[PDB]
Amino acid sequence: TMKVINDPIHGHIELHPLLVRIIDTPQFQRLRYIKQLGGGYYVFPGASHNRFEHSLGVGYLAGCLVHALGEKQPELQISERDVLCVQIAGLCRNLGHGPFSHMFDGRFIPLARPEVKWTHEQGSVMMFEHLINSNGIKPVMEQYGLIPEEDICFIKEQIVGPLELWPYKGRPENKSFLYEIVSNKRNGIDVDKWDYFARDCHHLGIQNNFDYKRFIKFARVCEVDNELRICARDKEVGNLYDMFHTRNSLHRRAYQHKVGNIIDTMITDAFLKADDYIEITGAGGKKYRISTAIDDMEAYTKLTDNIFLEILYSTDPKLKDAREILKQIEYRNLFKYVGETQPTGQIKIKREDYESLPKEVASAKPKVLLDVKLKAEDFIVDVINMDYGMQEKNPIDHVSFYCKTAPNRAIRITKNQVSQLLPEKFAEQLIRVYCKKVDRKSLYAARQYFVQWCADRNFTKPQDGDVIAPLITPQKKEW
Amino acid sequence: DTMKVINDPIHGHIELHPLLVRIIDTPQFQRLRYIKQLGGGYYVFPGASHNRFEHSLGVGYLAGCLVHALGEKQPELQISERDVLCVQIAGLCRNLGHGPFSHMFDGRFIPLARPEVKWTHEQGSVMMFEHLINSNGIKPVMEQYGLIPEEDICFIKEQIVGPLEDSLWPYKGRPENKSFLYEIVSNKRNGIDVDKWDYFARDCHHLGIQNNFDYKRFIKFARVCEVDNELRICARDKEVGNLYDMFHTRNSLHRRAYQHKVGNIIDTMITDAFLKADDYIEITGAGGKKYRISTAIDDMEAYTKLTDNIFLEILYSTDPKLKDAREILKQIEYRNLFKYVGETQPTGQIKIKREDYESLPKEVASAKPKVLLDVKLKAEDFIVDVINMDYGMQEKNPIDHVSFYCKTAPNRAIRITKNQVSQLLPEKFAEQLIRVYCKKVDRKSLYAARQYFVQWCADRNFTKPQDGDVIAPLITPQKKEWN
Amino acid sequence: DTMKVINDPIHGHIELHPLLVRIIDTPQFQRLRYIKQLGGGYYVFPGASHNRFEHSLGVGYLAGCLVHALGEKQPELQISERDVLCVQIAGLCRNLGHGPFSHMFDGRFIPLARPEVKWTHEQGSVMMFEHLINSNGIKPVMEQYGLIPEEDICFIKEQIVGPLELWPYKGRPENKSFLYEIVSNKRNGIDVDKWDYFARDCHHLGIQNNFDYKRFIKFARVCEVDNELRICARDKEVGNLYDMFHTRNSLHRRAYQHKVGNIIDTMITDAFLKADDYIEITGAGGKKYRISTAIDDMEAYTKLTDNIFLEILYSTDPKLKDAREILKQIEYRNLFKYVGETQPTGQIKIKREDYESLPKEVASAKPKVLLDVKLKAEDFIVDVINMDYGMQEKNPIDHVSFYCKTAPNRAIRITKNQVSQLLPEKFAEQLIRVYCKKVDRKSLYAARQYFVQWCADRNFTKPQDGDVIAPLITPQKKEWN
Amino acid sequence: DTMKVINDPIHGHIELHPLLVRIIDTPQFQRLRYIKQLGGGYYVFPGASHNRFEHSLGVGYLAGCLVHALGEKQPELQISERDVLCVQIAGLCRNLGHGPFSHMFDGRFIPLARPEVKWTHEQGSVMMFEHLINSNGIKPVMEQYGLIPEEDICFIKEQIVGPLELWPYKGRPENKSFLYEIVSNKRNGIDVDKWDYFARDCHHLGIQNNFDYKRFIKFARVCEVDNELRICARDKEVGNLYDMFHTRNSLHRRAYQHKVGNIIDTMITDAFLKADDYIEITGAGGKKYRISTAIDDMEAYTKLTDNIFLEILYSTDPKLKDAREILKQIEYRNLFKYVGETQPTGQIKIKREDYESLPKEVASAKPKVLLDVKLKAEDFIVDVINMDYGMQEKNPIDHVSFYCKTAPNRAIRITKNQVSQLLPEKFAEQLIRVYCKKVDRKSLYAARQYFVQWCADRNFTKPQDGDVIAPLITPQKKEWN
Numbered sequence A: 001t002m003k004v005i006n007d008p009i010h011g012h013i014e015l016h017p018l019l020v021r022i023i024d025t026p027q028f029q030r031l032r033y034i035k036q037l038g039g040g041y042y043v044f045p046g047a048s049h050n051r052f053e054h055s056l057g058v059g060y061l062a063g064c065l066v067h068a069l070g071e072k073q074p075e076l077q078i079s080e081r082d083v084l085c086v087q088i089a090g091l092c093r094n095l096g097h098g099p100f101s102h103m104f105d106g107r108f109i110p111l112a113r114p115e116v117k118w119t120h121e122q123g124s125v126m127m128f129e130h131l132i133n134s135n136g137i138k139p140v141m142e143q144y145g146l147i148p149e150e151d152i153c154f155i156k157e158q159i160v161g162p163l164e165l166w167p168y169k170g171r172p173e174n175k176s177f178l179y180e181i182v183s184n185k186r187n188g189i190d191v192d193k194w195d196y197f198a199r200d201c202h203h204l205g206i207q208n209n210f211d212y213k214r215f216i217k218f219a220r221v222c223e224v225d226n227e228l229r230i231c232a233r234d235k236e237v238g239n240l241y242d243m244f245h246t247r248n249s250l251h252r253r254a255y256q257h258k259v260g261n262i263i264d265t266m267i268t269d270a271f272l273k274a275d276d277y278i279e280i281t282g283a284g285g286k287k288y289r290i291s292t293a294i295d296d297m298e299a300y301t302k303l304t305d306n307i308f309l310e311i312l313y314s315t316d317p318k319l320k321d322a323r324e325i326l327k328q329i330e331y332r333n334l335f336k337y338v339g340e341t342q343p344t345g346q347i348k349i350k351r352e353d354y355e356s357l358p359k360e361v362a363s364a365k366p367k368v369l370l371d372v373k374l375k376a377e378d379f380i381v382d383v384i385n386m387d388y389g390m391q392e393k394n395p396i397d398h399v400s401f402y403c404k405t406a407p408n409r410a411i412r413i414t415k416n417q418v419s420q421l422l423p424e425k426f427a428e429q430l431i432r433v434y435c436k437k438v439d440r441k442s443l444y445a446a447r448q449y450f451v452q453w454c455a456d457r458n459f460t461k462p463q464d465g466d467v468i469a470p471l472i473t474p475q476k477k478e479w
Numbered sequence B: 001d002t003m004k005v006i007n008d009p010i011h012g013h014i015e016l017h018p019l020l021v022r023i024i025d026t027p028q029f030q031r032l033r034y035i036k037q038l039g040g041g042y043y044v045f046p047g048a049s050h051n052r053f054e055h056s057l058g059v060g061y062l063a064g065c066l067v068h069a070l071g072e073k074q075p076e077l078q079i080s081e082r083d084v085l086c087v088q089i090a091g092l093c094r095n096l097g098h099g100p101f102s103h104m105f106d107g108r109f110i111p112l113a114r115p116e117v118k119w120t121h122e123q124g125s126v127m128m129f130e131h132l133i134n135s136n137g138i139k140p141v142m143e144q145y146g147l148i149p150e151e152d153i154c155f156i157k158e159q160i161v162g163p164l165e166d167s168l169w170p171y172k173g174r175p176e177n178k179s180f181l182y183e184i185v186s187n188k189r190n191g192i193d194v195d196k197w198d199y200f201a202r203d204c205h206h207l208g209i210q211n212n213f214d215y216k217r218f219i220k221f222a223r224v225c226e227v228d229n230e231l232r233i234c235a236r237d238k239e240v241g242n243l244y245d246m247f248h249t250r251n252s253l254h255r256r257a258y259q260h261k262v263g264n265i266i267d268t269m270i271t272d273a274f275l276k277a278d279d280y281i282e283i284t285g286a287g288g289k290k291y292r293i294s295t296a297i298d299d300m301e302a303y304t305k306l307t308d309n310i311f312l313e314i315l316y317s318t319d320p321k322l323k324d325a326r327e328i329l330k331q332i333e334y335r336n337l338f339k340y341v342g343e344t345q346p347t348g349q350i351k352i353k354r355e356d357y358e359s360l361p362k363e364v365a366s367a368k369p370k371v372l373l374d375v376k377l378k379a380e381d382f383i384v385d386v387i388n389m390d391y392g393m394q395e396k397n398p399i400d401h402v403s404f405y406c407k408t409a410p411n412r413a414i415r416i417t418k419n420q421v422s423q424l425l426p427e428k429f430a431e432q433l434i435r436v437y438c439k440k441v442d443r444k445s446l447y448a449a450r451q452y453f454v455q456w457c458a459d460r461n462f463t464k465p466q467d468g469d470v471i472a473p474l475i476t477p478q479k480k481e482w483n
Numbered sequence C, D: 001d002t003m004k005v006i007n008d009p010i011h012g013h014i015e016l017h018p019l020l021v022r023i024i025d026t027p028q029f030q031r032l033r034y035i036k037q038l039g040g041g042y043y044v045f046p047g048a049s050h051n052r053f054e055h056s057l058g059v060g061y062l063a064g065c066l067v068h069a070l071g072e073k074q075p076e077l078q079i080s081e082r083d084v085l086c087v088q089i090a091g092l093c094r095n096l097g098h099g100p101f102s103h104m105f106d107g108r109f110i111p112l113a114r115p116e117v118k119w120t121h122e123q124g125s126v127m128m129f130e131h132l133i134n135s136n137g138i139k140p141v142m143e144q145y146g147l148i149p150e151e152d153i154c155f156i157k158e159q160i161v162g163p164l165e166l167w168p169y170k171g172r173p174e175n176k177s178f179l180y181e182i183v184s185n186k187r188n189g190i191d192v193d194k195w196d197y198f199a200r201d202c203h204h205l206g207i208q209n210n211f212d213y214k215r216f217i218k219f220a221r222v223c224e225v226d227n228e229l230r231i232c233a234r235d236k237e238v239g240n241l242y243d244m245f246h247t248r249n250s251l252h253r254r255a256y257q258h259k260v261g262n263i264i265d266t267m268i269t270d271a272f273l274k275a276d277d278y279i280e281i282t283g284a285g286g287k288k289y290r291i292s293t294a295i296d297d298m299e300a301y302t303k304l305t306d307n308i309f310l311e312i313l314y315s316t317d318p319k320l321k322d323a324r325e326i327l328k329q330i331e332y333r334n335l336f337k338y339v340g341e342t343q344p345t346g347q348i349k350i351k352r353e354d355y356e357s358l359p360k361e362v363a364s365a366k367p368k369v370l371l372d373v374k375l376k377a378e379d380f381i382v383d384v385i386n387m388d389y390g391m392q393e394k395n396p397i398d399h400v401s402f403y404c405k406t407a408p409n410r411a412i413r414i415t416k417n418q419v420s421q422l423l424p425e426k427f428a429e430q431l432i433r434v435y436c437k438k439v440d441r442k443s444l445y446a447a448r449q450y451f452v453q454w455c456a457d458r459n460f461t462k463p464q465d466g467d468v469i470a471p472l473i474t475p476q477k478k479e480w481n
């Protein structure tokens, strides 16, 4: 029968027996050993939470929204089968995450395997297949009325989008709105964000401004260009703009914390140095590396935050370089933040150029006397793209609304119709510079290079530019 | 007498010095128990039962926390217990001047009842404070605890209302080396003060909407630095994001709650009821002389007895003089409110001034929608509510008026511009919302009101109301940009 | 007419069926906005500005949540939408009878103003409910949404005040017995009214609530018990139920019976008594009532709220000078002085009829201590407080039924010894507080001596500060030493 | 170096003195990031991902808050910056000795792996602290900030573990007696460790905390008690103190002793015992230790965290097959099945030595019913839990000193009867849980029969579900019914 789980964010969640079966597998329980915020725990000591409990919350909210829609609009013909498939997708869309979450797909794999293209979403689909097949889930699905052929396709499609006219095979256009719940490809407004906002805020000790319950109460399905889509009540548009404001705040303060990022960067370097030597046993006893475990789900099942400690506690001399980096983290001998700047006006920095940037900083020629000369290897340059989840675009332009006077007619709402105090831009870049040399004189020099580089490139004046580089800031007229 | 502890749901256990307790325990202060913080807001958010009294304790407490923290970190500032008590007193007393239903009273009622007068709750707070002190023999008690009333009462008043008037330094209660003290209770430079911090947390706790601003963090990062020969409060540079967020939070709370369309209309209805009852309700002031609702502000003894009670006095009256006033309140009880028609905004530069407000109903009634109508409405049937939404300094960016310090040189004050922070911030800092309502509540009247309204918007190149195509499908087509 | 959504800080977004909106938007309901939940408690806990109105929305909401959950889990219970609405209405309306300052009114004022009458807020709720219905044409609206007014009105009233006198109810039959356990549980006190106030009062007071009502709802089922269908709790939740009552008693100790909130309630009552001949309140047919007689006419009672406090405070009439002076003393915080607290060691406690004699008893004590000042009966207030688990000497958990996971529809009983030996051995007690109206130093000192001597004379418990406030008295009593 | 700010979800922004930061930034301290506060609890309450690291910061912070409050109010105590830092350090470091899965390690594993040893996390904390100080050159930093390591290190250790052995302490004299009451209160258990874990565990478990430590701090004073200067609480707070222990017992019942959390702890412990011959941990000089002997070497113990769980689970060595299989069963949620709970009746207490003979006893019971299967001693687990108010039979409040507002320098005692007759009459009890290693339907049915029979045979209490799980057995015992 059903199980009750007490969650600090959602209170008492009811789990259908089929969901319990999916949960109680090595492939799912794995997520207990992957921190939701990775290196962030090393800055925010409340952020101990893992992918596992977040996944439960996502499945729960996915269920709440689909339930709400069915109760309010029985004409949608939403079935218990539909509800379960949506809950399963919600539960399983985090299955693909690697050690320290975004660090793994965002930092490590791009450097370890630049040729490969890999995302946690792809991983989630693969792990899900592995989970299903390894645990005899399909029989249990039919026992509760699911049709594995169609429904597994549907679940995968919810996580990763078309496995490619209506492009989906798992459900038809009349059920289009179902695909907006777990992972919303159209505008990013989905139950995954709603759980991490509330869960991260609870753990970080910073407050959440977004009311998902409210949103759910005001959600309706309407016909939009011959699709049935979820529409928000007109008056909730303010709150949706705010939801993305909240997202960006959480990125600024927490997910892209300058020191959290530097720790992620150091752990990634440790992983790269360990990658030749750590071995992970996959299917048939075959051995994989940290970087290649993603090619075999049996191996990947055993790849979690544990690697951090395996490296730290290692005695093998081959792992000395990797282990040393982690030990510096324990002593808190971290690379030093020098400053932040941004490109001015039009300019954007391409991913291909990231590598050249430490060279550029080291090449700057501040007109000041320096005891030390710094090298490209002494600098880290971290480039972060901050947006509203659709690059340059406004996601609210891709939301449909209804008004109380005509609940069946979907409408659009433009930014001008809402507020002139809203962002005029929806994407930006932040550039952080750090120095691996931590002494007083080194650090002083790093500041001079940095601010000179900013001037040379016509980037924005660092906020403390006049303090850290008083001789340099005057040369640039704009500043 | 000794220190008291009070449990507050927002701040926990608040200790109060005996002099503060003496000030609190007066008719002039306790009056604030009978004035709702959000006025007509309570009639939309049922949790907003809170009053100005408990907010005032919170402001006093926070004012003390900040001045105390500064003193602990920088003993060189020479902050005295006397300075601390004066700051707390000002914090405690800056809300004394509020009238019935708070902003309703100074924002809606007095401007209509007595357009010749200029009145603000801030001026009221000063007058009430003076009335409190004089009426209760507080000056002697102040000197008992080492305060110097001549300097200190001046200092307290200046903290609430600003310089009592030119000059580099316009304050008389304290010198430039204590300038940072004037930034705690009521910050005239940029509006970052402990009053905001209390109502964000308190209103959110009561409203059931979450607060994004962390005042405790702010206090930990705050320092005093020399700026143009003043000692001012500086925030850590890194916190500039959070300060922009503070004003964003303020704006959210205004949008969602303080300017809720229905809460506003209820305030308007209560105001009308007061205007109708103004001739008949009698309030006894100094010497037994009698005042009206609109004139109690001229005598603080009378003003002391002017609270939300007038609402119930009107509601429960039987005198036929008050029948009209009472009927409006009764319509509030049955929820037969004036009906919301819609909201629009002026586009681009355009702004509507205070002086124009009265001509607006006539304008809407003058618009000529090319639609057959069952009924024809008149100026009197419309209410037009203009709302100013800003960052507290009209078109100005308050963050341009903030001083920061950096960790490498904690005594050196600097400035941070918007470009130095983010491109995702607002490019403007002020806008206007125009709400239209109709006093005729029948279906046919409402339908007509919608047509006049949307036509008016179009005629004047205001923004398309969000529901424009639903409420006025025949009108919206004529304006091309809309559709 | 459509459903409304309301945002509550305790429950979030609450859906209100249009029939409930029609009930709410009446003078009789909206009245509750002007009655503080905790009365004079707000004068001690400044966060406790909340009113009976918002508490009533919460009770109506919780009542709905419970009956919906029961119906979803056991469709064989045959719960109807009609049932759901009637239970929500009863929940919304069980606080309608409350008077100015809530429990002050029925607990202190009415007993003293009109000792001959017997009156409770519950009786008031039923009367107001009838007045609300009749004055606003609600009966037709009830039938529009499928209710049967005659039966359902009876059902709602029974839910609030019990049987209007085998099966004693007329509104519903034995098969729906469990519906009577939701709003106002006469069997054991476990109902949704407590659950809202625990959470609401804690939120506002700023003290923490240890009870999880949502958990309770998730684990609740209906089972047959002595040929009645009753709400049963999961066996393992029994500890949590004991904890609920423990929490209730804590809230009484810390907040609802706060020694100063109680003396403020007493002072306001004294002002009301002194104003009651002069305040006039117009009821039906233009007839005039007093504060103490407005309870006989609902039209008058409709206009009787916390407002009277201010009507007195702001009065200029000389007749109200006495009443107005007491309220002024409250403002200056010149309150009656708490002397101390004690409890009876003996069983059988103290009669309500005996209360009047107690100040005289204190004044008649003869402490062997040097006193400058002699006090009189009239100088003392003696406030007797009954603290229990809701059922006098009885354990409410003995009147709860449970089910186990291996047999969810079978009811069982659980005894205290099956749960823990850390639980209470008694479930009722009395606190006695003494105060003095003379607030000078010498008077207070004297009052302490009489008090402690009276405790001794009566074999009450030694006040906690007894050795400090009455060092000459406490040594006489050997038990205390 | 300058002060650091840390954001904690429980306490908000915590200021850390440079010296404390130096202590925190060591492998010995950072180790606490990898030990779950609640061990096996995380596997039942998914919010309880929190680790000992963040709890230890909180304890350090609250230790500072108390000592700072006392110093501000009573400057005559002569409390020094040195005293404050020492109290904070002891608070920070009193959890250093915890092992994998916290209480599992010292409460279950070590007692079984090393029955000869007497080992407490407190002893471990003192050893780790020594290691931390010596390995990281902290003593020079201590003197840089004015500390005197010989006295102050002794004082810190004494705060954690008590006298390292008439005034028995050497780190501070009698005049500073009260300082030894903040971090680890040996007199009555009222200390800042509990205050952080109540609030932190509640925040993460998703259950409510009823104790207000900030209130307690505000009302705390130091008074002379029998020639010692001790921390005293305001008299009126006594209710809140009883409630603090009530809350602790509720947390244990609901969470720390959850039946499934406990069985998971038990399973993990077995896995560790089976891996103990084969897991190696490198300590000082490259030498290798076992899980059971890492406690002997601090360098090894440093690297002994919850990680061993995953090292075993991910292992391929066939010698670890048995240990790895137990952990794999946990992942599949194939746990030992809860059969039931009972308690000893009246007088009886269960001895530590007898724990191992209990499964044999259950298997020896002869239930008079037809059974498909016969079970053996090895198929049963019996878990005995001692629940109390921290001082076995004793009432901690009998060991607390109070003051009253009329004489704040005069310490007094308050007895239970002076407070409430609704309090516990007993302060310790035992709970006995039985589980079955055979999880099939027939086996579980049989296990229920043996269990209830065993309860009857030993005159333990009737399991709450006894009539449902063993309807044929419960009849025989008259007392039960």
Ligand SMILES: Nc1nc2c(ncn2[C@H]2C[C@H](O)[C@@H](COP(=O)(O)OP(=O)(O)OP(=O)(O)O)O2)c(=O)[nH]1
Pocket (backbone or CB within 6 Å): A004, A005, A006, A007, C212, C215, C240, C405, D044, D045, D046, D206, D207, D254, D255, D259, D260
């Ligand atoms: N909030 C709260 N949560 C609890 C309490 N006791 C347990 N929980 C949590 C732990 C779990 O996450 C969830 C379900 O725990 P239960 O003890 O109800 O489940 P369990 O499977 O052990 O009971 P069963 O005997 O199988 O029905 O609730 C409680 O007293 N209060």
Ligand SMILES: Nc1nc2c(ncn2[C@H]2C[C@H](O)[C@@H](COP(=O)(O)OP(=O)(O)OP(=O)(O)O)O2)c(=O)[nH]1
Pocket (backbone or CB within 6 Å): B005, B006, B007, B008, C044, C045, C046, C206, C207, C254, C255, C260, D212, D215, D240, D405
């Ligand atoms: N959080 C919490 N607050 C309480 C409790 N008891 C009272 N309060 C609140 C009510 C007040 O706002 C504040 C002070 O109440 P007290 O009873 O300590 O002050 P009171 O003047 O009655 O005591 P006194 O005998 O004059 O020291 O704390 C409690 O147990 N917990």
Ligand SMILES: Nc1nc2c(ncn2[C@H]2C[C@H](O)[C@@H](COP(=O)(O)OP(=O)(O)OP(=O)(O)O)O2)c(=O)[nH]1
Pocket (backbone or CB within 6 Å): A211, A214, A239, A404, B044, B045, B046, B208, B209, B256, B257, B262, C005, C006, C007, C008
């Ligand atoms: N949490 C939250 N509550 C809100 C917000 N806006 C309004 N509320 C509260 C006030 C009310 O208690 C409740 C319903 O307010 P609404 O403005 O949504 O309904 P109203 O009847 O004004 O609009 P409608 O009739 O749907 O046009 O929600 C918001 O953004 N967040």
Ligand SMILES: Nc1nc2c(ncn2[C@H]2C[C@H](O)[C@@H](COP(=O)(O)OP(=O)(O)OP(=O)(O)O)O2)c(=O)[nH]1
Pocket (backbone or CB within 6 Å): A043, A044, A045, A205, A206, A253, A254, A258, A259, B214, B217, B238, B242, B407, D005, D006, D007, D008
């Ligand atoms: N509540 C809140 N906490 C924050 C925010 N930013 C950072 N924190 C947390 C993370 C840490 O636990 C703690 C200190 O963060 P900071 O960014 O002030 O420290 P950091 O050492 O990076 O600053 P530094 O540049 O060294 O002064 O506060 C924020 O905006 N809000």
